[model samples]
Target chain A: ARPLEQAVAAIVCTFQEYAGRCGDKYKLCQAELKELLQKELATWTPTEFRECDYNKFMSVLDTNKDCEVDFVEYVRSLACLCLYCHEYFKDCP
Target chain B: ARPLEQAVAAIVCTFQEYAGRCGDKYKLCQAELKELLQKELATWTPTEFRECDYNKFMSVLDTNKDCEVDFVEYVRSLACLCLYCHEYFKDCP
Candidate 1:
């Protein structure tokens, strides 16, 4: 266990939908907790779900390969970092 | 002058939502953004159409030192990317 489950859960639980799905408002991210585990992350098409943007960005972001990209790491890769009030983000679909 | 209009435009438009000129591509990303977009959607002084997850998530995606995301940079970020394959295969409401 790379703690990916824990990590994903931490992220999902942050959302009210999943968190509220249970009893706690603090619990989230259950890609596995749901009944149809296989169905999860499958309903959406890659076209509807992703863009080529992420690969290129991550190639640059995953510099050290810890799989954790930080603020500076993010800024170094995307072009949209300049707009908004530091609302830097990617161009993925 | 950089072009977020083109950036965000390329994204939404390509969804076949606002595009005709954009064309298409095949891809796969598991974007869990919606869950996060909902929970943190409340943390803001006022908000809609976005969540803290989206905000924080986006904060991390903005790579190019500019202010926009191209498409490749997108997949690297999300885990549960959504796909309305129905619309794509069926062409309708």
Candidate 2:
């Protein structure tokens, strides 16, 4: 006998899309994300970011803190968190 | 009737939310945005962000390179960004 036709359901999401879905929690989650983003993406604005609560959240990923992370550092951070989020797409969303 | 049926449509946005919205282009937008944030939120870890991007871009902003930025300098540098990608809700959550 022929097998019944079937299909697998899937939900596609992206970093920005997840943000919208977070709606009510936008402020809360975004705040945390902002803190991390600020640190991970911080620039040396006249010794500015230092005052913005720069933490060690990603120091582990920034094997070499050249300020402007190279491909390796950048990839490492993304692989660690970005990739995780890309897959799980939970909580943080 | 006190009032006839009525409806309203409005669009709202947030930074990280906006980041997520970039969707398929998430990586690209994040890259550009990340660049802006890094240049805007960097701190002086041991040496500072200037030492990160070939340790050059940071010099454009860090006047003292004291390895940390003061609040005043932080706000000022944020404002000085040619673009307005450095919007972080402050004071209260």
Candidate 3:
């Protein structure tokens, strides 16, 4: 696969891996999202997951106030992270 | 890097690769976007580049009505693609 396709697949697979843990099977519950952040996004997320921090993160990701992060929401979060990385590197000489 | 990290890097690098082709190196002009679709996303994009098709695609990606796509818009496009893939695979047993 091309790098772009590979990247998309990685994101989708990672979401499914976590989201399928319990309930809905297609959305990330609070616990599932916490695990995902700690395991997959440790580079960007906090090393320690305090209750307040998790709640704040969930509030940002769960745009529809569903208390769960669906695929679209999950992808949007990744897009924000990618945007942050883009800004960080865009000035590189 | 973790798979998630690698995925994020791949998307960022892919954008920078094509967006740097011409004007506004931080953004992707029509020609640069066309090249990106043809080369990086051939799997999902049309095999041939028709002007109308390109325009429609651009309209969807450029949510803010900008002719060029910035990193955020580009990431949103990828996120939409990832959501499509997620829907396609979620029914798999």
C-alpha local distance difference test of each model: 0.28, 0.27, 0.63
**Residue range B1-93, candidate 3, lDDT tens digits:** 899988887887888777766666678755556567557877764223233444566565445443676676677666654433345443432
Pick the lDDT winner. Answer: 3
Q: Which model scores highest in DockQ? A: 3
Error of 3 at B78 (Å): 1.5
Candidate 2 per-residue C-alpha lDDT over A5-87 given as tens digits, one digit per residue, 9 for 90 to 100: 00000000122233344443122243334343444334312122332222344443254332332112222332333223222
Error of 3 at A82 (Å): 3.1
Q: In candidate 1, what are the lDDT values of residues B1-93, reduced to their tens digit? A: 213223332332232221222333322122322223233222222123334444555454333223332333432232221111111112111
In order of appearance, the predictions have TM-scores of 0.22, 0.21, 0.66
Once fitted onto the true fold, the runs of candidate 3 whose alpha carbons sit more than 4 angstroms away are A45-66, A85-93, B45-66, B85-93
Candidate 1, after superposition: displacement of residue B77 in Å?
A: 12
Candidate 1, superposed: residue stretches over 4 Å from native: A1-15, A32-42, A47-93, B1-66, B70-93
Fraction of true contacts kept, per model?
0.00, 0.00, 0.70
lDDT of 3 by residue, A1-93 (tens): 588888887888898787766666767755566567667977764222233544566466455433666676676666655444345442532
